[PDB]
Design a protein around this ligand. Structure first.
Ligand code: NI
Ligand code: NI
Ligand code: NI
Ligand code: NI
Ligand code: NI
Ligand code: NI
Lengths: 100, 566, 101, 566, 566, 100
């Protein structure tokens, strides 16, 4: 696979999102690291699908709502940023106020 | 020209009279003072203040600071103040107003070409924590403690060996020398404790001359009146500290016999509540004495619904007791008591217990000294309300009392307060930067001796440092020769005089301990209470002036499930 | 599209041009197989190979570099040899030459 | 004896006239020359050529090379040739024909008992890349860059501090000394940049004497005509390079005022297109001048469908602008322009921009300097066809022009071309081995100073090194004392003369920078174009000789989704 | 006072006559002797024996041990005994009875204030393993081997280069010097092998004088009679060992010609069975000779149902043979033979093969030398029953014969038995602690030179070291300067005399090899058999005294799926 | 669990295959690291099941076809190699030309 350090680092992010996805499925209200991991991994898969940066900047605001997270979590997350390999190379996706 | 207080706080951080909530607790701090001149705040960035001829001057390196932390909200034992912090030659240079004296008024921290900037607006800055109950079971404990905000670790051990699993002892000159050599690789300041349990003074002097800054007396090595007397005699000769884990079994005597063997000499009592070890059931009464500096270990802090359950089944694994034997269950109901565990939280709130510490991987959590100290302060505010010392509509005094428990008081106890323990001019610049929402839980930056040593860091390949995954990674202050320049190995006066650093080829900066024998309970900052305390031998009830001391167990705590992945 | 694909020019490459060559009949008289590399000094191969050793003095197999000729027990074959070049100094092998020639 | 060309290429790699596709791009290289003698190629293995008395000789260590890379396809600014490469004492000894002079003809690289072999048949070998725009935000950037094929990193910083997040500056003697000490731990060659923004020359001379090889002038520290003039005066006295990030705000003047302050003196303009910073909107016109060495940072390379979107929302996070304020959106439409971003790719293809660099974690990707350089070359071939300089049915000249951008030209710009930057006799053996299918993306071997420093490595416990998982792991060239012998710390002439290496106890090999002031645009290999360029102040259209310079954005790029897991 | 034998074994570990099963195998050891005085066993813990004035004495550091391993069950070539082990100054001080001479009888290991304790009751203690067939392909092999219980690694290489992928050779003075410098960073003892394939003695003397402790003759570099003769002549002059991988091709001669070139001189034959390399098909007959020290590499150990399949497809990848060519399949049926692979296991059981080794990542598994040695012993017990030398109802002799294969015999072969290889007074304290259920698979503690270097360690933040996840993590014995004091770099006598350690600034302790030329088959502990062995050139059948030597392939093995996650 | 470094290293390979398995399920054409991880993890589970080396050398050629991967991927993978603990200990599985 010849994995570079950045690819291995993203494996850590993917694994943290699996933890969050399983807790969400049980009906738990997500905490701070779980919410960040979940929305971040959604964006990485959207980049793999070939979605545009402008579409993910908007779609990333509808992954989790205020009712699916613990009190104070939306305010602890003013934005989420993640980079991934799009068809046209690495791009940065910034999602402003993702939880409303 | 005017600005609203809300827009001001968003640009420069809070000012006098503004209040900040500490993480998700019920503790609020109020800014007591602000050292700026409104309109002359220094801010770094595109088109901002810190630029040539503006907020940055023409001075040579000798006439300006190496680093400035701009618009910091300082939380320390002496005050909760808004100020710029200047660092020069790895030490705290000044707390005041930064900028350029050529165009700005009241500048006490000059900024020049040789100055680096850390933007602290909207952040809380504290001194690095000091943990004095470390079992050196593994080197990985250093990074865990550093990430939590602890920059100095005092303890003993040789690795995962039976002696170290149980006690903070680095036994003998050969292990002391090897552990001092190993310490150069770790990004925290270190001091070692030798094995104090011996009735021949020369076997102790030998360990002190090899490099230990203290001696641990532990019941697993025999905490008898003769061993205690011997260790204190050597401590008085060599200006080192003695740490005590007393005779839980009451084999050699009761608590009054241990106290008589001590004979009014200065001593640090570890896990004074007793779960971590000590005369059953009344070791807690030692906090009444003027020569005793009492600490708590953290699993009993604060008292919660799961405390006993995890503590009754902890002793059954460590000492291999088994619930089938009645005499072992009678022993289990001897070190683990609801009454002393509930009272300990109140004794911390009143200032009768002066320090907090871990007891790392030996009935203690290395990354949770700070976190648990704040959880106790929260649980005490909720149950007891405001302290008698409290002024204003805030928890400033309670905050000053609790921060002293893991910063200045451990430093004073171990004779290292001349180097570390508080944000004061001349001390090593070991500083921790916190965002208010993560105060006490996850720091934004850990500075060791003037260099950033560890920080949360995002994707290495990203266009900025903020993209996911963000996790703690070692920085330049933790690498090779830069690390050696930014950390301290503490030595006894005899080891420094004897050229131990040159003999072992130690590469880090060296500091020497002093003033261990003259420190007393009255010297513990905001934690000098000597209560008239009694423990009932039958019921274990703790009373102060005949009044029952108790608290209720928490079912939910702040600084817990909102922040951690597991 | 194949990443890193070659577009090789069609044709053939002539090897060891302008050097003296000779042919020898070799027979493996041993009971175990013998394989000989492209650059081994042919006159100093395993003694179980029977051929005119004087004709092979200072010669090697005329085959692509890094390839070999295999001689199964009893196998007889004619091989083409090519003269060594450079200083024409032979050191090593069975220690028969250990100097120029 | 004859062999077909197809069987020959499968055993020894391609020869004269054969063509190879670079990764999954549309670029094809053609082998221009082959230094072998057909039939006398050296091959290592069971029953192969490199054996005692055969392809390996009887010479002592002094008369043979330490390492040979057999049957390499070299891609460098001077040629695309098939040859053996000899390395001796950590430096390139010869490019030619390896073997044993006792039995083989035309041997220029002797192989003996003291020789190690790297089998390069079917691989491309290039010089290690040189990135001159590093922000030292974290040490982890060194391994990321090394894995990508970059062996030298020039930049400034102290860790994740506000000053370093924004600028490539290591401010002052104390931070310079600490970062030089830290550099010994990193497996890349390093040179540091000081803070050049000051109007007093002594504050600059002090930083040069401490060890910096250059000074960065950054607008965040005030890029005024007086600071620029001062930095260039010191640079001319001390033979160091100046790197410029100009006044985007046009606060102190327009681009013509910055250019007049420069006064024909040698300077390196960072991110010359302007998105990364500089006079809005016409910093790009500096590439017309003979004393300017212009580089690009990589997020704008090449122009793609997502570039603007990620760049409009990048500036809103770095400078905290917010889309609600009209004056901040007017500022956003000032640094981020479709017209200059599209023109930059063409200016690289014509040779008007001479270097590529990252701008690591500060509007740049540390592991993508090489990858993005090749993506630009591909997009330019596709849109523009063959260059005017191109001969034959191949892209050889375009390849030589682009490889120079991250190898020889950064080296010449920073005064280090006497040590690194190309595969030439006498230079440090920093070499990168690529399989053609992964050219520019994932190297097979990274050699630092003659030792393998990092490589993809499979299961440690496996019976061979190829079983899964295969990932990049540090090798012997990256460990302790072997690393110190195989890397260089670059110093200014004043620091070397003053014994800075001895004072700081630097353990790595030292090299000194020279020739920074005499390098000009005409010296940039295959990238010496001085076009008559104009930018329209209203529309931002870029014209060369009145002709509009533009390109189309890519929707899909090579060296992207086929290779990376995320 | 009396105690039952079952309660005794649960508190102190087994005693004389008790039997223990080794992991999940069919091997049982029986305690042969016990050096304690019943009732005077030392035990550490709350209220236990090792306490001031009790099991711990008043002696100064010079009169007591630095470390005691209490109640250890020793398994070594000389006996299976219950004893306390004392360590002082990083070396084995005594095997006997520990405690305090003031109150206890028969104390030979004194315990004082300077003594650390490792509780070994219920554990097996062995010497650290010695692997003499290391290809230095990557540094990560050191931790993998250390975790498996191997503390010394002898081999050659420069990293993942073609020469090293194939051979254990560190070619020439420059690579030898760089690898000796790199060795200081690794937590195992190291000795290097040079390239022995040359017909000029000075090219060999140069490598020995640079620091190698041996020379590897490998067929990939030409294993001709002249190169072999030359290497042995130098070995006889310089007191170093020669390791041989013979001419598989029979290019220069048959096995009798290689044996005649050797001329009765001492030599170590690597992978003597032949799959790993050597004269096809009869290299195995070398084990009949008195001057040959024969080892096996581990993928052929033991013979299993999947052995051939993975070995026929291993040779097709390493040498790139392809199944389409008939002459390459004829070559595949030449190195890979069912008959010699089945016979090798029996020859190990009879003591005709004296050592086991890996052939790390070059047809060998670095973490499986110990594990596979025990799997062979199990498969041999199951198929052949008790050895002729066996007394009692146990496998004690078979255990002593097999443990010698990876401990004392490699040490004797390489001239390092004066420092390591067994638990004997005066030797370096490289010790491995095993729980019986994980014997040979996953150790509980690995001690290097008296300090714990690696151990399984649980959650760093936990209240104890046992909570999940438990995985191997480096300890204090593997850090910086402590590591240098606890490991050895072995040098030739010429390199030590010439000041190579001072010239290269080597930081670790140095040891010198001696006695390589006088060791013979008769010196191999419990493995000195010289059988009259023949191999049929047609069928490959192995016979000893005309009797066919064969074994059956295993379908399931112990020390496999019950323990490993993948 | 007392995980050794080799066991931890195989956890990385297992995680990379989970990423690939989820992308394949969405109907994406797999890239180079995803294809290698997917086929490699299949072989490790086959070893855990007790399948023979000769059976996995053949079965590993039918995990992915040319139509389930991106252009050029089959040619970037001439073989896949992985070792795992079989009932009879560690063995190497080599799968020649796994994608056709
Ligand atoms: Ni204790
Ligand atoms: Ni403790
Ligand atoms: Ni810039
Ligand atoms: Ni920059
Ligand atoms: Ni071999
Ligand atoms: Ni080998």
């Amino acid at each position: 696979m010849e994995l570079t350090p950045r690819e291995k680092d993203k494996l850590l992010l993917f694994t943290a999102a699996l933890v969050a996805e399983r807790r969400l499925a049980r009906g738990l209200k997500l905490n701070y690291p779980e919410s960040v991991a979940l929305i971040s991994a959604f964006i990485m898969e959207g980049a793999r699908d070939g979605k545009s940066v402008a579409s993910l900047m908007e779609e990333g605001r509808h992954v989790l709502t205020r009712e699916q997270v613990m009190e104070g979590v939306p305010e602890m997350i003013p934005d989420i940023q993640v980079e991934a390999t799009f068809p046209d190379g690495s791009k940065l996706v910034t999602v402003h106020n993702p939880i409303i | 020209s005017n600005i609203s207080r809300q827009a001001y706080a968003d640009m420069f951080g809070p000012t006098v009279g503004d209040k900040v909530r500490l993480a998700d607790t019920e503790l609020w701090i109020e800014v007591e003072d602000d050292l700026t001149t409104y309109g002359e705040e220094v801010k770094f960035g595109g088109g901002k203040v810190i630029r040539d001829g503006m907020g940055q001057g023409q001075m040579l390196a000798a006439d300006c600071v190496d680093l400035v932390l701009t618009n910091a909200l300082i939380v320390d034992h002496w005050g909760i103040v808004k100020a710029d912090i200047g660092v020069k030659d790895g030490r705290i240079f000044a707390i005041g107003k930064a900028g350029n004296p050529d165009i700005q008024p009241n500048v006490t921290i000059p900024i020049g070409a040789a100055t680096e900037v850390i933007a602290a607006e909207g952040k809380i800055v504290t001194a690095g924590g000091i943990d004095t109950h470390i079992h050196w079971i593994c080197p990985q404990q250093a990074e865990e403690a550093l990430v939590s905000g602890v920059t100095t670790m005092v303890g003993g051990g040789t690795g995962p060996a039976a002696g170290t699993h149980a006690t903070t002892c680095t036994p003998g000159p050969w292990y002391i020398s090897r552990m001092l050599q190993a310490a150069d690789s770790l990004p925290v300041n270190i001091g070692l404790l030798g094995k104090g349990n011996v009735s021949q003074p020369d076997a102790l002097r030998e360990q002190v001359a090899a490099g230990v800054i203290g001696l641990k007396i532990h019941e697993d090595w025999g905490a008898t009146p003769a061993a205690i007397d011997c260790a204190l005699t050597v401590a008085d000769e060599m200006d080192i500290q003695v740490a005590l884990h007393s005779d839980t079994l009451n084999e050699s005597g009761f608590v009054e016999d241990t106290l008589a063997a001590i004979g009014g000499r200065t001593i640090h009592t570890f896990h004074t509540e007793g779960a971590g070890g000590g005369h059953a059931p009344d070791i807690i009464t030692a906090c009444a004495h003027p020569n005793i500096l009492p600490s708590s270990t953290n699993p009993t802090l604060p008292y919660t619904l799961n405390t006993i359950d995890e503590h009754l089944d902890m002793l059954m694994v460590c000492h291999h007791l088994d619930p089938d034997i009645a005499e072992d269950v009678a022993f289990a109901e001897s070190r683990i008591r609801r009454e002393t565990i509930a009272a300990e939280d109140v004794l911390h709130d009143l200032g009768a217990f002066s320090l907090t510490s871990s007891d790392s991987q030996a009935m203690g959590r290395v990354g949770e000294v700070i976190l648990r100290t704040w959880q106790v302060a929260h649980r005490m505010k909720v149950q007891r309300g405001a302290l008698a010392e409290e002024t204003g509509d805030n928890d400033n005094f309670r905050v000053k009392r609790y921060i002293a428990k893991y910063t200045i008081n451990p430093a004073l106890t171990h004779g290292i307060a001349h180097e570390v323990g508080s944000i004061e001019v001349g001390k090593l610049a070991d500083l921790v930067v916190w965002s208010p929402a993560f105060f006490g839980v996850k720091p934004a930056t850990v500075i060791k001796g003037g260099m950033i040593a560890i920080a949360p860091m995002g994707d290495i390949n990203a266009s900025i440092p903020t993209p996911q995954p963000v996790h703690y990674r070692p920085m330049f202050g933790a690498l090779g020769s830069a690390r050696h320049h930014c950390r301290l190995t503490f030595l006894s006066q005899a080891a420094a005089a004897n050229g131990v650093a040159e003999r072992l080829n130690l590469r880090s900066a060296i500091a020497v301990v002093k003033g261990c024998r003259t420190v007393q309970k009255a010297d513990m900052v905001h934690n000098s209470l000597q209560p008239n305390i009694t423990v009932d031998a039958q019921t274990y009830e703790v009373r102060v002036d005949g009044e029952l001391i108790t608290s209720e167990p928490a079912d939910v705590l702040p600084m817990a499930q909102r922040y951690f992945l597991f | 599209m194949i990443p890193g694909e070659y577009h090789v020019k069609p044709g053939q490459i002539a090897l060891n041009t302008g050097r003296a060559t000779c042919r020898v009949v070799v027979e493996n008289h041993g009971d175990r197989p013998i394989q000989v590399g492209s650059h081994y000094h042919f006159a100093e191969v395993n003694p179980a190979l029977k051929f005119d050793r004087q004709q092979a003095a200072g010669y090697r197999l005329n085959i692509p570099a890094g390839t070999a000729v295999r001689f199964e027990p009893g196998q007889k074959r004619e091989v083409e040899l090519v003269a060594f070049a450079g200083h024409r100094a032979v050191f090593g092998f069975r220690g028969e030459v250990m100097g120029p020639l």
